[PDB]
Amino acid sequence: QPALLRLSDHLLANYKKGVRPVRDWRKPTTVSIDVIMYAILNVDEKNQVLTTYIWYRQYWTDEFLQWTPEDFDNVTKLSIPTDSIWVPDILINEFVDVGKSPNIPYVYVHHRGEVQNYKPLQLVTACSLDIYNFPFDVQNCSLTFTSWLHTIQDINITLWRSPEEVRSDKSIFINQGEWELLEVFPQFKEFSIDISNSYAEMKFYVIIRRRPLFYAVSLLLPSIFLMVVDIVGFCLPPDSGERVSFKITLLLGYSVFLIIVSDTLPATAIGTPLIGVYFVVCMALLVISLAETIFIVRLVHKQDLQRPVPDWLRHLVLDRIAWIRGLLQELSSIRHFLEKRDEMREVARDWLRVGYVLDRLLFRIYLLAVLAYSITLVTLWSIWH
Amino acid sequence: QPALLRLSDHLLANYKKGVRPVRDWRKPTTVSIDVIMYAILNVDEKNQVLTTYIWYRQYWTDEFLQWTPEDFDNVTKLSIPTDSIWVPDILINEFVDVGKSPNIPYVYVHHRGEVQNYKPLQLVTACSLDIYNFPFDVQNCSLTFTSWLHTIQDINITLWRSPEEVRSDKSIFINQGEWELLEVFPQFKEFSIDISNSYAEMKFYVIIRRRPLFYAVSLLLPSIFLMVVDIVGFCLPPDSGERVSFKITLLLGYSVFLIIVSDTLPATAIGTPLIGVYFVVCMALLVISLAETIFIVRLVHKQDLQRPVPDWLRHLVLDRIAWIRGLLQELSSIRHFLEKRDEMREVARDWLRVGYVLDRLLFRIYLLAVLAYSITLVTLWSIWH
Amino acid sequence: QPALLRLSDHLLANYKKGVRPVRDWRKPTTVSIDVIMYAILNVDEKNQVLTTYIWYRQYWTDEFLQWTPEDFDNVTKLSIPTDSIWVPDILINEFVDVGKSPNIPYVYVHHRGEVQNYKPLQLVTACSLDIYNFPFDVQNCSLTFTSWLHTIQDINITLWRSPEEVRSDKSIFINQGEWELLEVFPQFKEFSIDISNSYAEMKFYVIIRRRPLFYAVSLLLPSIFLMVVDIVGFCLPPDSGERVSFKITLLLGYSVFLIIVSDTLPATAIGTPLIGVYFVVCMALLVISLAETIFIVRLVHKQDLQRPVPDWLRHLVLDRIAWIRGLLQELSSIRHFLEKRDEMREVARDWLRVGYVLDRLLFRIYLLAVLAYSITLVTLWSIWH
Amino acid sequence: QPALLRLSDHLLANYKKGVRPVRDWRKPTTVSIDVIMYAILNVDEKNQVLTTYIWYRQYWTDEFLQWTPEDFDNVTKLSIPTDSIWVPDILINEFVDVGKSPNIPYVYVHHRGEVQNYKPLQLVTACSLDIYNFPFDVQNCSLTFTSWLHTIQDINITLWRSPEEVRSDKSIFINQGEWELLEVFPQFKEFSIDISNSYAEMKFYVIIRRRPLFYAVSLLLPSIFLMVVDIVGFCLPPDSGERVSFKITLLLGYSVFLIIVSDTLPATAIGTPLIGVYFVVCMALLVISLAETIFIVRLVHKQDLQRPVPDWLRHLVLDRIAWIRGLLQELSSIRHFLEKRDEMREVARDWLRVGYVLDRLLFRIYLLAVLAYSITLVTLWSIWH
Amino acid sequence: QPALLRLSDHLLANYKKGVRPVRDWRKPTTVSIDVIMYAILNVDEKNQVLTTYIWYRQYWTDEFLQWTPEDFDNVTKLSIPTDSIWVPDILINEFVDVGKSPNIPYVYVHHRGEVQNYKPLQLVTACSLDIYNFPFDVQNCSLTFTSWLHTIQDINITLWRSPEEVRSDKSIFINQGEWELLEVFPQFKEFSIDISNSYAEMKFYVIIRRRPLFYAVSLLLPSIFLMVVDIVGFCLPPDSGERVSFKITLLLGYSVFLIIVSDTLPATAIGTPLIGVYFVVCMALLVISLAETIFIVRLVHKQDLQRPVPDWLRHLVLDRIAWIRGLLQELSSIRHFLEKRDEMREVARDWLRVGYVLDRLLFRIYLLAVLAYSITLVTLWSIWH
């Protein structure tokens, strides 16, 4: 007789698969688990879910599947289909849709009754995401493995291995994605929602950090590009009537661009992300450039103004060294029309050189409000790097 | 003999799982339920559905699964697979797609015949959404648990616990999302669509309110930004020929922006939301700014107009203090060409100072139609806060 | 003995569930159905499908499930699982994907053999949509219930109730959506695709009408907004050099807006919708405004033109009352250069006042081509309302 | 005894459903099929798939389900569940996802052993799409029905009916969609991937043609609209300084529009579609309009140029008839400043009339490069119509 | 007796399908596989997955399904349902969702016990994508077939055929898509995650290359189009006041276009793709064109400047040959006002001809920075072609 199916006839003849396998019912069946995390497939932030592929394994002690290796040609391990034995109902408290993993149809059984079960499982799980510092963020998502029905008296959950070996496990993990795990942190916890019920659970805090190197060329590269167009835009002469149309076109291009980057961050009501506050301050610096162009074109215009006041013309003089026959009465009438002509040219000429020395020094103030304000960026960048 | 599977052989030997378990058929099997709501996953408003994760439990009385704890070593609870016993067909009247929850394969049975069943269930349910006051809204969505086939004579539905304990249940609930539940309100109701049929149902009015703090920085922050660009835009001199091109560019940027925010609110035919009516009034204030610029550039232009009328020049004078040899005949011909030259300059100069004192006071009217109209915003904001 | 499972042992002992239950095989099993329509979930027009939630019920006569209420304690109704009896294969000819409804696991049986079956069913069904008059449209979608395999000799289909009661059934229906049903119209029809096969079917013409009140504020509110910007745009003086840049900017904004509304209507080759033809006529009215601005700026320009012809200057005069020492030769040379100077100013001044009296009356023609053309809108609106 | 389930007890008592039913194993079981195509649901071109709803039927000869109509009250047809008999594994070589069709749970059996099986089946099938002539295209997609495991020796595939009747079958087909089938073309073919294996297959070449009447109002209606704006745009005078800003705005609007229509056509590397080549030639005609405006504004400008050369002024004269006391020395100084003034006006006046007669004839060349080039469109349209 | 179901009664009478079929348990069951790849359906790069349709087959040796062809009329092959025998649990380590393939319900068995199993299987598999050289890229995605539970002692994996025949297999493969496979490379590998467990696996490195011919007309055709608009844009005279509005409009159109092409490439943190670095250098060349227009309009303007310095006027002269009665005092006053008039015209005239000879030679430098920089494109194109 072949000895490998003589054994399965001995185990599964009178085996009843609907009974929690134990001889004294007062003790629990202590399962023992661990995770080996393979990949982080996607982090959906607007929906606050997280899909993950995990290699997973359990063992528990089945007191009805015991034998001796003699009378069976020293068989010490054996494979049984999963649908023909008892199996616990351990699942996750935090799933959203779990139908993506196939069922492994086989389990091992040892000669002491140690049934061990290997299966892959994908987990579209719901964990709250903190998105405050957007390119430089670590996440803290839980994976609470628990028995759904059975209490402490029936099913208790411990680990396969030591909790140090779970923390530093990068044995299989797919790198060169968007995320990168630091550690998987296990913790036993006894859960109770009311009196007279207590449930075992095993949380796995998987922490991951975003690799930020892509988002420099999608959130900072056009923003610094829209600044060097603004720096060269002050070198238009304000008398052209084309400088204000330059600045409103630039702010138009900035405004369309900010729409594009708004859709990524979620509607989580803990506030705004920290980088999104900067694009408001980046946008308000364009308005100070837009309010500076309107002021000097209001100040310098062919409008037939009044005289420049010498109280400020002396103030502009100090800053200029810092930042820069009755035929006589008839023919007298024709020169008087030209007396008024060139003099009103010189009135607008007096307002003219005022609007350039206020153009230069306010361009220096704008250049120091950019160049000294960029040092604040790299020092917050280098320390958090 | 081990006593835990001796009991399951005693219960499930001649048990027929297709019969509603009762000895006198004239009495119903009164199930009893409650919900423990875990999260609100998404509220799709354009489709008017609502997905929700709920911890759920039932018990009913099975008169065929009774035993005595003696002859079984004082066993008082026991686990049976769900597919091997009777189970009611309680489901929801308002689902759209329910396939996302796994089946819990186990139930408890007590020694009196009290079968109790724990299961998670996700509910893409269809509830009508009222979206009138958009950032500040409470919702009222039903969850009508009922038996689909059985009538009052067969299955009646009551609650597990007191209806006060269901209302104030925040024991497990995931916060820091978009929504926040106030209460879950149960109510028994007897349903009847015709004569000779009556059905038990248990409605659960779950009310939730949106946390509005995110939508201030996505529906009010660019709208107030497009006003301070409009306030500074009046400081262009109207003689530039660049002011009307400024105002139409601004209204262009506003018009593109209103497209972006239109896609959120649904096509529900109860009317428009209340905040969407304000963006029309916000848009019509830009037209009054756009109609004011066209009027003064029509009024002030190098066009060789007629004289300003002294009926309104005196009216502008009052508001200015409030808001602000035959050689003689040949040579006489050359001055007359300059007589006509400077005089038509002074005609346009007379229309010139009119268009600035009407520019200033209409800018004060526009500034008071903004600043006093913003007080209406925060008082409606603070009371509803 | 308990009498409720003594009955199910009597019915389902030798019952064979694979046989169409009848004693004389020459007669059909006449099923009888009706629908109770609950909601219209979505109408996808680009794909021409329609999803609908329907409460549904059948009964047929099973000649093998008969008993007498005596010997069973006057039991007259009983519940049997659906998978343990015969059930017809009645389904829809027009489905696209039907997997969204759960299976009701129970049926009633009466003491005469009247098995009745209640189930919900969702129907992503394919019906052709007529989209000609877009906001004001009724639809006519079929729901052809038929047996897929069995012919007239085996399965015939009739109704539960009278066909008048199906038509006026609004007992349960979720209102305050986008659609609103007028009636559900049943009609028996015998189907035959060839010789020697005839099939019963029961069509249900469900007609629904769109509530159009939302699409007034998404298809007419910006279109009338882009007209009042065009009406005020004629009050620019044509000498500014900023009026043509105003009109092309407006047509730019209109052109981008028409892209946004194009994606809703499908690629159904019965033609264009009727409202989409109007937006072409709405767009061509902007070109007549754009061709009118180009004509007067071509007519009025500092170009050193020729004289205005008195054949049309008299025509403009009639419409103006309707719509509105050798020192002498040397010094004679300097006045002749000013003779040519002011005269060519008066030549452009003669073309100047022509271009305003043609500006005013063509603005009246444009104002009457708008105001009288809007009366055509509301009269087609009020009658179809 | 009722005779309809006495027959099913006679057929399915010792019937083994895992054996290919034949008495001499050396002959094949010749199935016979046909398709009745109901609708073409969608053609996804970027993914190159095709979903189709097909009414489908098979018959094969089962030598174990034979009887005589006597001893059974002249029963000649009978219904058996599909899961209780043998059924071939005929499926499609070209599917992508086939889970959308329900299983018909019944088959007919005749008294000779002719089992016939009716089922609907939806087919998201993968066929390569040729998209060269985009609005006027026929497709040629295969549907290769074959047995997946069994060879020629076990399962052979023929047709139900004559192959002429399959070709001209429009008995049920949903029209008024986007597509329209010409014919379904069957062809038997013996498949072999290596030595010692040969497989029967039955290809069904379904050819469909797009109804092009919708895409005239979405690919040609705005393109001809952006030409009549270009035709009227030449009537701006080139001295305005607003004509180049008109032409770049138009090319901006064209460039945004071409983005919108690019997303439809796939990334199939057989080249570009033929209509997409025309929009490049449509775009390059705008550049010749844009290069013509830049040339005449470079030629006509207040720049203090040199003299016009009489070598080309005579050439412009020919085309103009085709396409169109020491007081004397002091006072002599003041006329010499006006000698230089009006003469440089006449130098720019000489370049002025040159730039209009080159404006008119190059506008005639552009008008003949449009009007004669539109005749090429309708002749390629009418023949392919 | 018919001999084909007499054989299946002999094999499957006492067959236990839950036992790994072997007589001596110490030897493994060596399965043997290969793949025949049919199509590459989609490559999702933002999600880094890959869907593939593969024809697949296995055989293993079943020691319990042996017979002799005599006593069964020389039957040497036979078909058994898959659910009635043992089958290994060979699956893929790298799947994401595998539910899209149907189950083939049949297997062959030979008279020696060689069970062979044919099935199609679709594989949304997760492989890391290298996207550095975007249009010209080869991919290297693994397909690791392994037994999930069984070790080396139970299941070992080898190939059907020689590993050379797998490499050059294009027998069935759907061409004329986006991708094109070079080879499928098999490699045996023994896997071990810890001590005391060793697993067989069979990697299949399928390498595919993108056909780049479509992306020339979607990533290079508008980019070279936005250069010839820039080349003709220098032929505007800088005195128009319309040239800077031309250049900012062009950069606006370029900036919107770069948004459109950004969404394809993923967020993989290995850096940026190589073609995306070029569009930054393509964008910075427009800024040098935009900084050149601002410089000459700052240099040439009616501003009443000072004199041009003869240190650079001589430098411009060298490059111009390379790149190009008390009535007397009263009447003396009127000429002095015209002395100042024409002289300040000649001051701006002196700056005028400077700004054209710097316009021409900087246009030659820009033309050589384009034409010589395009030779770098085609040489990198032709070698990698």
Ligand SMILES: *[C@@H]1O[C@H](CO)[C@@H](O[C@@H]2O[C@H](CO)[C@@H](O)[C@H](O)[C@H]2NC(C)=O)[C@H](O)[C@H]1NC(C)=O
């Ligand atoms: C949600 O809506 C339901 C009905 O639409 C409200 O239920 C009503 O509650 C009042 C107060 O208890 C009862 O008098 C009515 O009989 C109830 N109506 C029905 C149809 O049962 C419910 O109060 C609403 N929720 C909130 C928070 O107001």
Ligand SMILES: *[C@@H]1O[C@H](CO)[C@@H](O[C@@H]2O[C@H](CO)[C@@H](O)[C@H](O)[C@H]2NC(C)=O)[C@H](O)[C@H]1NC(C)=O
């Ligand atoms: C669709 O394509 C197939 C092949 O790609 C065409 O089938 C060919 O038809 C001709 C004419 O009957 C035969 O001579 C060839 O042998 C067929 N080819 C194959 C591979 O069998 C088919 O004709 C095409 N459809 C149309 C409408 O032309």
Ligand SMILES: NCCc1c[nH]c2ccc(O)cc12
């Ligand atoms: N083929 C993968 C077998 C395997 C090896 N080590 C494992 C660890 C966990 C697990 O679920 C599975 C495994």
Ligand SMILES: NCCc1c[nH]c2ccc(O)cc12
């Ligand atoms: N593991 C969660 C068990 C659990 C504890 N309390 C519960 C309440 C309801 C429920 O369905 C389930 C539970």
Ligand SMILES: NCCc1c[nH]c2ccc(O)cc12
């Ligand atoms: N719980 C809903 C039971 C029900 C009451 N009336 C009905 C009518 C039809 C139907 O399918 C079902 C019903």
Ligand SMILES: NCCc1c[nH]c2ccc(O)cc12
């Ligand atoms: N109810 C549709 C029955 C039917 C009638 N003719 C048919 C032809 C083919 C098929 O699969 C089915 C049919």
Ligand SMILES: NCCc1c[nH]c2ccc(O)cc12
């Ligand atoms: N009908 C396809 C049968 C077939 C022929 N050759 C094959 C090779 C592999 C495979 O899985 C299947 C096949």
